[PDB]
Scaffold this active site. Structure first.
Site, PDB file in Angstrom:
ATOM      1  N   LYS A 262     -14.145   8.850  -4.347  1.00  0.00           N
ATOM      2  CA  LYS A 262     -15.399   9.243  -3.740  1.00  0.00           C
ATOM      3  C   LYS A 262     -15.902  10.578  -4.329  1.00  0.00           C
ATOM      4  CE  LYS A 262     -13.478   7.153   0.327  1.00  0.00           C
ATOM      5  NZ  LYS A 262     -13.111   7.233   1.771  1.00  0.00           N
TER       6      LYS A 262
ATOM      7  N   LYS B 148      -8.337  14.023   4.329  1.00  0.00           N
ATOM      8  CA  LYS B 148      -7.478  12.843   4.331  1.00  0.00           C
ATOM      9  C   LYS B 148      -6.548  12.970   5.570  1.00  0.00           C
ATOM     10  CE  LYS B 148      -6.031  14.022   0.302  1.00  0.00           C
ATOM     11  NZ  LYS B 148      -6.063  12.872  -0.638  1.00  0.00           N
ATOM     12  N   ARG B 149      -5.895  11.889   5.969  1.00  0.00           N
ATOM     13  CA  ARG B 149      -4.992  12.030   7.097  1.00  0.00           C
ATOM     14  C   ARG B 149      -3.933  13.116   6.791  1.00  0.00           C
ATOM     15  NH1 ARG B 149      -4.964   7.859  11.272  1.00  0.00           N
ATOM     16  NH2 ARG B 149      -3.263   9.227  12.074  1.00  0.00           N
TER      17      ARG B 149
ATOM     18  N   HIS C 271       0.802  -1.206   0.000  1.00  0.00           N
ATOM     19  CA  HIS C 271       0.000   0.000   0.000  1.00  0.00           C
ATOM     20  C   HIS C 271       0.834   1.255   0.000  1.00  0.00           C
ATOM     21  CE1 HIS C 271      -3.896  -1.950   0.767  1.00  0.00           C
ATOM     22  NE2 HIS C 271      -3.167  -2.861   1.391  1.00  0.00           N
TER      23      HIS C 271
ATOM     24  N   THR D 240      -8.170   6.777  -2.371  1.00  0.00           N
ATOM     25  CA  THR D 240      -9.564   6.371  -2.593  1.00  0.00           C
ATOM     26  C   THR D 240     -10.554   7.496  -2.335  1.00  0.00           C
ATOM     27  OG1 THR D 240      -9.572   5.411  -0.424  1.00  0.00           O
ATOM     28  CG2 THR D 240      -9.210   3.948  -2.343  1.00  0.00           C
TER      29      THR D 240
ATOM     30  N   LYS E   9       1.187  14.305   1.645  1.00  0.00           N
ATOM     31  CA  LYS E   9      -0.108  14.624   1.083  1.00  0.00           C
ATOM     32  C   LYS E   9      -0.172  16.125   0.750  1.00  0.00           C
ATOM     33  CE  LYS E   9      -2.616  10.654   3.177  1.00  0.00           C
ATOM     34  NZ  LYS E   9      -3.636  10.339   2.040  1.00  0.00           N
TER      35      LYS E   9
END
Ligand SMILES: O=c1ccn([C@@H]2O[C@H](CO)[C@@H](O)[C@H](O)[C@H]2O)c(=O)[nH]1
Ligand SMILES: O=c1ccn([C@@H]2O[C@H](CO)[C@@H](O)[C@H](O)[C@H]2O)c(=O)[nH]1
Lengths: 810, 810
Positions: free
Chosen positions: B654, B542-543, B351, B650, B548
């Site tokens: 969405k 998101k985290r 992952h 993911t 990120k």
């Protein structure tokens, strides 16, 4: 099958079956091909619980509208045992469920054996709390049991190599279908912190908060549709608790440990912080709940007309400074008014006079944990001692004896002294025990306020202790006199006009035989050992304590054995001696006593010369559901405490009710039982209270009995020399040493009278017809020992509420 | 009300009502006068659960008789969220329950808000496991999720003074009606001990036993009557455990701490013992259960034809030596045969490629905790390295790189290397991420066994992510094309022939407006803050992680602000920028980033000059049920990770499904999404993977971008000088220092392209009709990102089982 078990109607049986099948499917998520007996127990358990709720909801509704005075029974112990059969019995569902389950092809009795005991207590005081709740529901009082939901109850006892091993009692592994969690009524409880003074009063600040979450368990009355509540608090951490991160979450356990385990000391005080926390926690959450219910009807003058709080021993004595705290610091009443409310609200039951059992908390503990409560206590003491000084001017010794504060080594708080000062009533638990309080440990208090001191002789519920455990006897009693005695146990007197009835004699004796056969097989099936069912069943079951004198019993057993061996070919009435009970994990002597008893069995039970004539069995894991089995099977009940030490006893009452004869001393309720049945119908032996004092004044020298009684000398020599432990000849040196040099309980002093009294029992046993007529005379006079009588007296003479036998509508 | 929500029949509505009333009464022990909304939620929750069980029981029965190959999905994370609505949707009960509850005078939506999220995971990997279970049940596979029942899930995030505070997530306080405890299938798990060698093999002895108790949660397929099982293990002490007495009972907690709390690190490895215990515990209890089910059909050749085990990252990699252990030491198969069975049974999903996220366990830990497993691992490694040596003779460097054992400071075990050696298939989670595995971190492995490496691009379930969270959009889609797309998401392609349909354009835009209005009120009601609903909703959720690049987002926000302030009277498309996500408790930088974002809000949101034009909101406590609300309300989805770092993503999917446009980099599944919709329908900016490597070779110097870009220089100066924190002028020195001297993620390198790309978004937004036609083109090509497609490929290409859409009988 049997009439006292109710109607098996075609409607009810059909209803029970469909609901049983519904629960198996929806609730348990199983079907018939994968279901174990455990799944069947649960499906029955949910089905029967369905009949409670409607009744439970309207009982709580009724109290809301009628607003009667509420009774609050605070105890750290509720020794409930199993709930399924008791629920069926009190709802009149027993035959219907038997039918319903038979038709589904199951055996209901086999299903009952799967239920875990709720072992949330130690012995007599915990179990009295259980009988009381049943009685309170039966007499229609608006009553609440409050306590702690212990995750582990009294430990399971295993015997390994003749020694007690303790194992955690994980009674909730599989679920408890009887309880309903109520997280919506969670309440904060405070610890530590410190006291700040302001213009408007004292403030308790910087505290740790523990949360108390309640679980409600229904308490069904007997066939009256009343269902009361037993509410048990569980400890929970708050969510900002300690809140590096992982460790903070793991430490939530420190706070929840409060409700984790029941302390297993019985008749012995252990001053551990974790114990004091449990005591405060039950009292803090309970008073908030009480005060909350009171406000939902500003005016505290009427609090005592709407609230009664009964303290079960001194374990919840913090109720007293706690209620002062709330009333003074939070509701802002003045001291004098709050105190009057407190005294009028609280009442206190003592259960023992043994000095090692009394709670005396170190001041350094209360200071740290409950700094405000210590202040309140110092203030209570000061004002109390000014009433003493003013009633007995110049008596400085009285002042130090009566102080709630003990001076010495470390300062202590005497919690008994606190309960007396802050209660309008103090009671003992049998008549002789109540006189002993007045003459000895509480004499100063009694001279000050004679009017506070009462007696309320203990009792047992005839629902569990007769109808439930002994349907056989209940039935034949019902054939002659009707069913009404189940909630009016006095009616058993009518049984006296059957003492010469030949058919009754044979029935009473047939029931005993059946119970003995049944128990004898229970011994072979579940614990693999063989007993002659024709022998006299001589049983002593109760917690193991020096004062209860299991050792006395052991000496008799060894005597019978040495007499058989001396004259092997002489006839002796054969006996099965059974002794059982748990020892507190740190009570070294108690552990030694259990080992002695099994060692005696290792010798006696494998002597071929003895044969079938004498067997000694130690009954492992004595608990409520084991009492329901052995008690109906007993011929002889041993209640042999040194006079003045057993406050009341309640095992004694269970045995009188179930057709055993009693051998015992003039101690506790034994005195009132022999008074009710007539002394001729009872095997009384040994010193009275007065003889014990006479022996203390001049001094107890056990060597004297050893020098004069050759049968006793020989037992001691056998003990000392390794007869009972050939691989450790000195294994029992502690017991011998104790017996010889510091027996606080005078085992030898009673030995001679005991053995002689025991020959009288064997002799009556040789004449079955006359043994049974004596039994009939015991059973017929046990009425007084019903907890319905006990609770009716509490209600009229302490709480100021009237019982009633009246059905609520269904 | 709306057709995709099913029939409200007169029979069903009447049935639902009577059962709701039954549960309120019997199950909750309440009535209408004392019930809170919470009691109503529970009564509905038990009522809906009643429809599952029949289906649940026959699904498990069907598998017993058909005996299909079973799939076992092992994960330490299952991020389920709420269960009630999802259950209604998959059972077609939604309108019926709405009706039924409306008639009882309740609002069902208000009741849904009371359910706690099951937060049993961190973010993308945990939530993929949840989508997978839904998809597996929907495609009729005999599949089981296995994991840990954590007593506390991901912590609840509160913002105090702009900082993250963590609070324990006590999700079980009130009960979980969905789970069924199954104490009858409790299994021992072993720890510590040591290894003994005998004539007949190795033996693992002197172990501590922890018990694993399973809880089953039903997993309903979509309208096919399949109900699969998610089984979660809880830790329990054995009853002789530690068994002075009090302390022994209290220490049962040490063993139960295994299942107490989820570790909150996402994309970051933390080598703590308690974590390794959790990893072993799930794998030990799960394999025994697997082997038990297998035996109830001696012969392990057929084990791989009856069993598939999917490893969700390396967290359950101990499955591999564990299965070797059981097969070799307990079942006595020879090594070579057991190994072939293992490889054929297990498969592994990676992952991430971030080096700090990879599990490398210290050898000294495994030695102490799992001494046998270490031996097995050394043996696996030795035999593996002999295949390497023999395929690449003389390549000594390959041998050290491929070793499962890392040499150095402390020896470590590389768990990824173990999963590759012991699995027949290894997959990445998006096409580009799969190529990166083959070219970079697993290149040696790939050259050895090319045939093991696959891709399975991630997906989301359109049940939760469309029908459940966005009924509005589901409905209008259903009006045009039917309901069939709900389980065949490819059919959304048919929506392309409506891209020029005026009525569809207005409907798609009307749904977005409504969702925005609804979410805007949810902001005011539950968190007291005001947003213009006419603004573009720019959301990054998101985290919080450096990779990120929430910081990139922050710099854009500051740019927009500085541009408004420079030319205040110039028109700008107004925006609400929302950013949300949790930071792992020890990730200092992540915590700083959250503080920066709120500091930007403190300034921007109170500048009167700015007015309504720019708002910055930090969305507290981002979790599954908050995603179901914000995602339908979004216009712009920010997916701006540095290329090569986001394995798949993911959240991105969405947002594509729910009518937001995407701004992002050519990273993870962004690449395949732009490929499906066409690049013109997507806002791509910034370096590609290759540019990032080019910049690394020559070196990243952030000073270069600071010297050349005056808009960026000014932001940094404002950061450094206290503009955003006037009371701590140096509050953000760490962030500036990082950005300037050690940015592993090249925020400045992408800054220019980002801002420019962002002006293109504002420009398209000025033309509503063309914004919406671009939306329609995204929604219509999201079909590929359904987890039904993902699972069908796992099934055919890894597990060797065929999906089917076929109803089981009801
Ligand atoms: O710690 C104690 C103190 C007293 N009792 C018992 O209470 C029963 C209930 O009143 C009495 O009948 C019994 O004599 C007494 O020992 C206990 O069981 N534990
Ligand atoms: O520790 C990790 C490692 C990876 N992922 C995510 O897995 C998702 C499911 O495959 C991916 O879409 C996402 O890119 C990845 O970061 C996590 O959520 N946590």
């Amino acid at each position: 099958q049997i009439s006292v078990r109710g109607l098996a109607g075609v409607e009810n049986v059909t209803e029970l079956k469909k609901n049983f099948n519904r629960h198996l499917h929806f609730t348990l998520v199983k079907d018939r091909n994968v279901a174990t007996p455990r799944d069947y127990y649960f499906a029955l358990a949910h089905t029967v619980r369905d009949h409670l709720v409607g009744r439970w909801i309207r009982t709580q509704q009724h109290y809301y509208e009628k607003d009667p005075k509420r009774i609050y029974y605070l105890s750290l112990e509720f020794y409930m045992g199993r709930t399924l059969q008791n629920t069926m019995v009190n709802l009149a569902l027993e035959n219907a469920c038997d039918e319903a389950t038979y038709q589904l092809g199951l055996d209901m009795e086999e299903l009952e054996e799967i239920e875990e005991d709720a072992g949330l207590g130690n012995g007599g005081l915990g179990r009295l709390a259980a009988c009381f709740l049943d009685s309170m529901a039966t007499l229609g009082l608006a009553a609440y049991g409050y306590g702690i939901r212990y995750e582990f109850g009294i430990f399971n006892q295993k015997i390994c190599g003749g020694w007690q091993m303790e194992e955690a009692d994980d009674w909730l592994r599989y679920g408890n279908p009887w309880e309903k969690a109520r997280p919506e009524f969670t309440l904060p409880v405070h610890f530590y912190g410190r006291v700040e003074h302001t213009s408007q009063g004292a403030k308790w600040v910087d505290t740790q908060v523990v949360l108390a979450m309640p679980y409600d368990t229904p308490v069904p009355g007997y066939r009256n549709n009343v269902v009361n509540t037993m509410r048990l608090w569980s400890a929970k951490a708050p969510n900002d608790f300690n809140l590096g991160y992982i460790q903070a979450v793991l430490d939530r356990n420190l706070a929840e440990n409060i409700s984790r385990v029941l302390y297993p000391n019985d008749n012995f005080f252990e001053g551990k912080e974790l114990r004091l926390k449990q005591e405060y926690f039950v009292v803090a959450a309970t008073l908030q709940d009480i005060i909350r219910r009171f406000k939902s009807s500003t005016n505290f003058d009427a609090f005592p007309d709407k609230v009664a709080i009964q303290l079960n021993d001194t374990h919840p004595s913090l109720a007293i400074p706690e209620l002062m705290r709330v009333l003074v610091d939070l509701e802002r009443l003045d001291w004098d008014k709050a105190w009057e409310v407190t005294v009028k609200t609280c009442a206190y039951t003592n259960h023992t006079v043994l000095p090692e059992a009394l709670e005396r908390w170190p001041v350094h503990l209360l200071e740290t944990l409950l700094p405000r409560h210590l202040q309140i206590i110092y203030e209570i003491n000061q004002r109390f001692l000014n009433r003493v000084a003013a009633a007995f001017p110049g008596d400085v010794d009285r002042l130090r004896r009566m102080s709630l504060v003990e001076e010495g080594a470390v300062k202590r708080i005497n919690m008994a002294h606190l309960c007396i000062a802050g209660s309008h009533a103090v009671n003992g638990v049998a008549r002789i025990h109540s006189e002993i309080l007045k003459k000895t440990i509480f004499k100063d208090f009694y001279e000050l306020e004679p009017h506070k001191f009462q007696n309320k002789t203990n009792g047992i519920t005839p629902r569990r202790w007769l109808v439930l455990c002994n349907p056989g006897l209940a039935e034949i009693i019902a054939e002659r006199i009707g069913e009404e005695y189940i909630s009016d146990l006095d009616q058993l007197r009518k049984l006296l006009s059957y003492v010469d009835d030949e058919a009754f004699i044979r029935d009473v004796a047939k029931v005993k035989q059946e119970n003995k056969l049944k128990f004898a097989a229970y011994l072979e099936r579940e614990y693999k050992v063989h007993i002659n069912p024709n022998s006299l069943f001589d049983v002593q079951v109760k917690r193991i304590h020096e004062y209860k004198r299991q050792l006395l019993n052991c000496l008799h057993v060894i005597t019978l054995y040495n007499r058989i061996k001396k004259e092997p070919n002489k006839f002796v009435v054969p006996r099965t001696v059974m002794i059982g009970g748990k020892a507190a994990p740190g009570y070294h002597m108690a552990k030694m006593i259990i080992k002695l008893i099994t060692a005696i069995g290792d010798v006696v039970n494998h002597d071929p010369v003895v044969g079938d004539r004498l067997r000694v069995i130690f009954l492992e894991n004595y608990r409520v559901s084991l009492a329901e089995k052995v008690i109906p099977a007993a011929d002889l009940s041993e209640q042999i405490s040194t006079a003045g030490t057993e406050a009341s006893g309640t095992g004694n009452m269970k045995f009188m009710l179930n057709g055993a004869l009693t051998i015992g001393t003039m101690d506790g309720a034994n005195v009132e039982m022999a008074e009710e049945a007539g002394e001729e119908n009872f095997f009384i032996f040994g010193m009275r209270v007065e003889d014990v004092d006479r022996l203390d004044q001049r001094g107890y020298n056990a060597q004297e009995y050893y020098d004069r009684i050759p049968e006793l000398r020989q037992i001691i020599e056998q003990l000392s020399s390794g007869f009972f432990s050939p691989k450790q000849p000195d294994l029992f040196k502690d017991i011998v040493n104790m017996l010889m040099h510091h027996d606080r309980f005078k085992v030898f002093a009673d030995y001679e009278e005991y053995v002689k009294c025991q020959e009288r029992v064997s002799a009556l046993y040789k004449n079955p017809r006359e043994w049974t007529r004596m039994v009939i005379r015991n059973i017929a006079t046990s009425g007084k020992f019903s907890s319905d009588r006990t609770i009716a007296q509490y209600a009229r003479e302490i709480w100021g509420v009237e019982p009633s036998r009246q059905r609520l509508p269904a």
